[PDB]
Amino acid sequence: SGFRKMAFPSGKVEGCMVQVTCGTTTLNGLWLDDVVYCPRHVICTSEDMLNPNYEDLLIRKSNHNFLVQAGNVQLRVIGHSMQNCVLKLKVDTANPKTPKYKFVRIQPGQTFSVLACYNGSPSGVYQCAMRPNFTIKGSFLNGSCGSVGFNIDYDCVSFCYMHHMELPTGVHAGTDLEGNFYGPFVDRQTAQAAGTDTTITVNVLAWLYAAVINGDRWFLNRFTTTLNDFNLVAMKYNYEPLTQDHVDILGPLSAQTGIAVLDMCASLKELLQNGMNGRTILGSALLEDEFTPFDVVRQCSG
Amino acid sequence: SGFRKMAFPSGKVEGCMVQVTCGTTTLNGLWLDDVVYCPRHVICPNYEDLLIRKSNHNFLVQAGNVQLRVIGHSMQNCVLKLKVDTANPKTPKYKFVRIQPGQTFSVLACYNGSPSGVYQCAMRPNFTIKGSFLNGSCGSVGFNIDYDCVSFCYMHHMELPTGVHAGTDLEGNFYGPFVDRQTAQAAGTDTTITVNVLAWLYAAVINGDRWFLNRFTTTLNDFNLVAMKYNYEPLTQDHVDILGPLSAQTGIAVLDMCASLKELLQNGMNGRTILGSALLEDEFTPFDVVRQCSGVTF
Numbered sequence: 001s002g003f004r005k006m007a008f009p010s011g012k013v014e015g016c017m018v019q020v021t022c023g024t025t026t027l028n029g030l031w032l033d034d035v036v037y038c039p040r041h042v043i044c045t046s047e048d049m050l051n052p053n054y055e056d057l058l059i060r061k062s063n064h065n066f067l068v069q070a071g072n073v074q075l076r077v078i079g080h081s082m083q084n085c086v087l088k089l090k091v092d093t094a095n096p097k098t099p100k101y102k103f104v105r106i107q108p109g110q111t112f113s114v115l116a117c118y119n120g121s122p123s124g125v126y127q128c129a130m131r132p133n134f135t136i137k138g139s140f141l142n143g144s145c146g147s148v149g150f151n152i153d154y155d156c157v158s159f160c161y162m163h164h165m166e167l168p169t170g171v172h173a174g175t176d177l178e179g180n181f182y183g184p185f186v187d188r189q190t191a192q193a194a195g196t197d198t199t200i201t202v203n204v205l206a207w208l209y210a211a212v213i214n215g216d217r218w219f220l221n222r223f224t225t226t227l228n229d230f231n232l233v234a235m236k237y238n239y240e241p242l243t244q245d246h247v248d249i250l251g252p253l254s255a256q257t258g259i260a261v262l263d264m265c266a267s268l269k270e271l272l273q274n275g276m277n278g279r280t281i282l283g284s285a286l287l288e289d290e291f292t293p294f295d296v297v298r299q300c301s302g
Numbered sequence: 303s304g305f306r307k308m309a310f311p312s313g314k315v316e317g318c319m320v321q322v323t324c325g326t327t328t329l330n331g332l333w334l335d336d337v338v339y340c341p342r343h344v345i346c347p348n349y350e351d352l353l354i355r356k357s358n359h360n361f362l363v364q365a366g367n368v369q370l371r372v373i374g375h376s377m378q379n380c381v382l383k384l385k386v387d388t389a390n391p392k393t394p395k396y397k398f399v400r401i402q403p404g405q406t407f408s409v410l411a412c413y414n415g416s417p418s419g420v421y422q423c424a425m426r427p428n429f430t431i432k433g434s435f436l437n438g439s440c441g442s443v444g445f446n447i448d449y450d451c452v453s454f455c456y457m458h459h460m461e462l463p464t465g466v467h468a469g470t471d472l473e474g475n476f477y478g479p480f481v482d483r484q485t486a487q488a489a490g491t492d493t494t495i496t497v498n499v500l501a502w503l504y505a506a507v508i509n510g511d512r513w514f515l516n517r518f519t520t521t522l523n524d525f526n527l528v529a530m531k532y533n534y535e536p537l538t539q540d541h542v543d544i545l546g547p548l549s550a551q552t553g554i555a556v557l558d559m560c561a562s563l564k565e566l567l568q569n570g571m572n573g574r575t576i577l578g579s580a581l582l583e584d585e586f587t588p589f590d591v592v593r594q595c596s597g598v599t600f
């Protein structure tokens with residue numbers, strides 16, 4: 001019993017964190033086999049940050065300009081290449097702690113663990129979701145660039161995020177491990193803003209099923225709804241549309257609890273209308289949207 | 303910017319998790335040097351009588367895909383110590399520490415000696431933890447990291463009828479009035495960790511959330527009267543002193559923040575949130591707020 005915002009054990013990712021220094025800039029790198037991955041903006045000063053021509057800045061660099069530090073050992077950079085917004089620093093030593101890994105690009109609503117790092121040293125681990133507006137509500141200070149987001153289903157680490165930037169609202173933007181940004185963001189200081197954020201509906205429903213599995217049923221009602229009427233109501237509370245894919249994905253939780261997805265949708269409609277009335281659901285007074293249907297099954301069943 | 307419930311990096315603890323099997327029971331063990339620590343209910347009650355009947359080979363200890371050989375066994379309070387022939391090469395610098403209610407720690411939840419998740423939590427004033435544990439999680443540990451030293455503070459033993467959890471420090475002493483036996487046991491009435499709520503209000507101020515601040519201050523005695531009425535732990539002079547750095551950083555005296563908390567308790571949030579929460583969060587200590595809002599590494 002119990003329901004916690006749970007991150008994956010970070011050990012496999014900790015053994016990959018390194019410090020990358022370029023001139024005055026110091027940030028984090030991910031050392032896998034003989035390559036160190038890091039944000040390409042490590043080659044920028046902060047003055048050439050408004051409109052940097054990364055190809056032009058990178059061609060002027062030599063391998064010895066990049067100082068890579070893995071613990072108290074300086075790694076030797078033997079090559080460099082840029083792939084989208086990530087810099088790939090070929091080093092002369094393969095990381096002996098390299099876990100089984102994959103680079104996966106995630107979709108909005110997906111969750112992952114973040115190993116926040118400063119100077120190549122892990123300081124904390126927390127659980128995140130990719131918001132529908134492609135930002136993450138992280139906890140990052142200056143120096144955290146290059147910190148990574150991941151999932152560890154089974155023994156394979158799936159890297160899905162690399163931190164690059166903080167937007168003016170305090171939210172964060174970054175790329176997959178191929179250097180492609182999530183969202184319409186660019187790695188430059190031009191005026192950028194997170195789009196209006198919406199609640200991840202399928203995740204809220206999964207969390208309502210988690211509460212039912214944990215013995216809480218107060219919010220359930222005798223009503224059902226059509227998928228269209230649910231979405232017409234959902235949109236008015238800035239909730240993401242619920243697709244037939246999401247209804248299908250919620251199938252196992254529906255079968256386990258005996259509450260049809262559209263029946264749980266009618267509970268959600270009622271909660272949106274009434275609020276909680278001094279009550280909580282899984283120790284929360286707000287509807288939680290950073291647990292996917294997959295997270296709920298993993299945590300509640302194994 | 304941002305404020306998350308953040309756990310310590312679990313790597314140093316992952317290298318210590320093993321699976322302990324005895325009879326039909328399978329649970330987790332903590333392998334440090336040549337000893338595996340696990341709950342004594344794995345033998346299970348007269349635990350001295352049950353243990354004397356067990357031989358070393360009855361305990362099957364598995365570290366990954368390698369079976370460890372048990373060369374001795376002894377009991378210390380509600381913890382069983384299984385001497386093994388091999389010292390754990392991944393043994394970090396560590397200490398066994400007993401924590402106080404209100405202190406926080408990271409839990410590395412495990413099943414079959416394999417770490418499955420890490421979460422942060424606090425020792426409640428009623429000595430329970432609001433954890434997330436299924437059957438098979440016994441022996442999962444709670445810890446903090448101080449520089450490069452892992453301080454083990456908790457070992458999971460059981461789940462109470464309300465879904466909350468009870469366990470021991472690594473010396474086998476239970477937190478709370480609990481016993482490791484199937485009997486009627488209930489978590490006592492819980493209270494809110496006042497010093498932690500204040501630390502979280504300072505974290506919200508540091509993050510740009512000031513709506514709850516007011517011009518008022520209060521005496522410590524008047525605040526404790528209000529706090530007692532709302533099932534909040536008494537705020538001591540030690541807690542006021544501990545909150546000093548955050549008070550100096552934000553420019554809001556501890557008793558000034560106490561007057562914000564009093565108004566929040568009497569009037570509610572009024573549809574507003576603080577750090578994305580509609581409830582007052584009490585599972586961040588003043589040290590956790592300083593560590594996160596200043597980026598300390600391990």
Ligand SMILES: O=C1[C@H](c2cccc(Cl)c2)CCN1c1cncc2ccccc12
Binds near residue numbers: 041144145186189
């Ligand atoms: O946002 C940025 C900077 C930046 C600027 C423009 C484009 C890029 Cl790709 C990156 C680089 C550091 N950084 C930060 C990243 N995360 C958290 C932070 C907190 C407080 C100050 C800064 C922070």
Ligand SMILES: O=C1[C@H](c2cccc(Cl)c2)CCN1c1cncc2ccccc12
Binds near residue numbers: 437483484
């Ligand atoms: O509470 C117990 C049992 C127990 C019984 C008597 C004495 C002791 Cl010390 C412990 C052993 C397993 N266990 C659990 C431990 N944590 C979470 C759980 C969740 C769901 C079911 C069980 C759980």
Ligand SMILES: [Cl-]
Binds near residue numbers: 105106110
């Ligand atoms: Cl995805």
